[PDB]
Design brief:
The chain is mainly alpha-helical. The protein has 6 helices and no strands. The chain is elongated. It starts with 10 loop residues before the first helix and ends with a helix. The protein binds one RNA strand through helix 2 and helix 5. It comes from Oryctolagus cuniculus. It is found in: Cytoplasm.
Length: 113
RNA sequence: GGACAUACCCCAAAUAUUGGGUUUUUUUUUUAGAGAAGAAAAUUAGUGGCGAAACGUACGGUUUAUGUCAAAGGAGAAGGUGAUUUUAAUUGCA
């Protein structure tokens, strides 16, 4: 529909072309970005609140891996936040050692694997 | 010298503009996104009093006959007499 529509540059498309870029990003933001900004916020909340440490979840690390592969399909600036998320949650583990949680030592699953 | 810790600082970042990183000094409390805002307590009457009989009557419990049914015994057990002969007393029967 976007490159079905007449590209033959009118004034309204020419005026915005000192700041802006292509029509596909301009209208994909209207119908795709509210869904990928939901996928991000779905993943981050599933990690952060629910599975802080809690030893009994290999799913936590499954989600982390899946959400890293999600960044290869869509936006990248929601991947620096993902790194910082893993950094602070790892920092949160070996600072307290204070709940029925992950013992990151000889334990092959919850240290190596 | 004034402002700054939810940093008024630091980094990161274009289709991105919101994520992280740090200073001490006091006390303070064991964690943090939850707990109070809904399923419960209670209530009773305008509930007449007293009260039989006729008729009717069950499963059972035990006593007494009764039929049939299981072991033990034909030494036993034990009932019946004018089949007999003499005789005073005791115990007696063959």
């Amino acid at each position: 529909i976007e490159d079905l529509d007449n590209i033959q540059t009118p004034e309204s498309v020419l005026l915005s072309a000192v700041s802006g870029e292509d029509t596909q990003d301009r209208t994909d933001r209207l119908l795709l970005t509210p869904w990928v900004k939901f996928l991000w916020e779905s993943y981050r909340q599933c990690l952060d609140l629910l599975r802080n440490n809690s030893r009994v979840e290999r799913l936590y690390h499954d989600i982390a891996q899946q959400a890293f592969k999600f960044c290869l399909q869509y936006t990248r600036k929601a991947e620096f936040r993902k790194l910082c998320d893993n950094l602070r949650m790892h920092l949160s583990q070996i600072q307290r050692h204070h709940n029925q949680s992950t013992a990151i030592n000889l334990n092959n699953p919850e240290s190596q694997s």
